[model samples]
Target chain A: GRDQAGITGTWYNQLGSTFIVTAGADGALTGTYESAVGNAESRYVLTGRYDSAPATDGSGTALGWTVAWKNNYRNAHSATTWSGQYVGGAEARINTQWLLTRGTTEANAWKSTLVGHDTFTKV
Target chain B: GRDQAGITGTWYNQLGSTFIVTAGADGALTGTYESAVGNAESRYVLTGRYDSAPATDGSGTALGWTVAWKNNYRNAHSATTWSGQYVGGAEARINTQWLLTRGTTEANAWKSTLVGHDTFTKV
Candidate 1:
């Protein structure tokens, strides 16, 4: 039963970050990431895909997305990606892991490439 | 520039839980989970995979895994999955998001499904 019908819409994260998801028939995804981290008003382009097929763990649908900031942040390669799965409930939730690549020096690269968890809820 | 060789071996979470990861040539992953939540003595089997390929966000390598438990103190569907990416540095780090589905009733299901972030370090 492969179906991802309800995945289209605005999903908000805990950090005041939000994205509007539009899924194509072929699993190609298009979205807009409005962040609060850098500029609250900047809406960045998002790219990635989703597979409604049962996840590796037989849990929900596998979801992954990426956002590359065009902003002139300190890190020239300021980009981020979130990996996780989406489970539908009374309220849809996406539990995801994220990594933000930043900093200019290799010495600080390890600590600069920050990583964490983010839960996105469909609203 | 794809390489995930440094991902093998042991990693620890914030909750004092530990998982041993072994990755094969084709991103095949096998691991064991020793938890701090319930039955610390119980070593559970883990299944998942990792892709050393550039992440969707063009960040680190994609990595994921899951664990299930059914001890007397747990629900039948007590399970969790970690979705994340691995970074090899002076201090190797894995950033992941997790969801624990453990509930007997739909009423408690909303809050019952636990979600959070787990940062694992190879220390």
Candidate 2:
């Protein structure tokens, strides 16, 4: 049967970034992004875990569990490559904080500050 | 404008298998598949084609179609390191017979028996 994710919401933040959302039948979410941040046109697969099962809060609020986002962003982007908290308000306000990680090493790992946020609404 | 791939159909299959359908703006169709077949978790992306107009079929049927799908599965999966026919019926049935490519060769390039039919109803 055709079961849609039925998951719909918005993002909140401040930054110059563009994003896309994909919805799957039976519930799946993957997103691609291009930001002025470190990762240029970073292609990422973001998995969404609802804070509550069978119920998704439509408000643009950050949840408890971490929404894992893996990047296939090209390295030509920058050295400060990382992932951060995606927060926002009425519209999709994407604010990236501490670099999730820079190099793929243990010691060099560092997070970024709330440099800015960017928001993308459902088109 | 937020362009949706705008597709709707029912697969025709009787294998008792299930399928998923995902949608994207600018119209992207990516499906994650898991069946009684080899790869337990296989994912693929398909760019869509209108073949006709901005209209879709709510009926369980096939169309003038050549949708491309790329697979990313673990090798322990099989000697059939390949992809193949994804045919189905009104109940969302699946039929992947041709070992798309054996050992990544053009030798095993065989299309499959249009086994069964499965159509998924729009929920």
Q: Using DockQ, give the best candidate's number.
A: 1
Q: For candidate 2 chain B, which ten residues in a row score worst on lDDT?
A: B77-86
Residue A109, model 2, lDDT: 17
Q: For candidate 1, list the clashing residue pairs, or say none.
A: none
Query: Model-by-model lDDT, in order?
Result: 0.60, 0.26
Off by over 4 Å in 1: A1-123, B1-4, B55-58, B71-76
Cα misplacement distance, residue B119 of candidate 1 (Å): 1.1
Local accuracy of candidate 2 as per-residue lDDT tens digits, A9-95: 433224544445444442233454455454346544333211112212232221111111223323331111111212223333322
- Estimated TM-score for each candidate: 0.48, 0.29
Candidate 2 residue A118 Cα shift, in angstroms, is 4.8
lDDT (Cα) of model 1? 0.60
Model 1, span A1-123: residue lDDT tens: 243566788888898788898866644456677886763356765655555344334356555565644433322334566656567768778767666644234344445455677889975
TM-score of chain A of each: 0.82, 0.42
Q: Write the per-residue lDDT of candidate 1 for residues B1-123, one digit (tens) a residue.
A: 244467778889889889897866644456677887653356655655555344344355655565545322332344566666676668778777665544233344345455677889987
Per-residue lDDT for B1-123 in model 2, tens only? 011222333232244334444444322333433344544445432222111112122221111111112234432211110111122234332212211111111122122111222233333
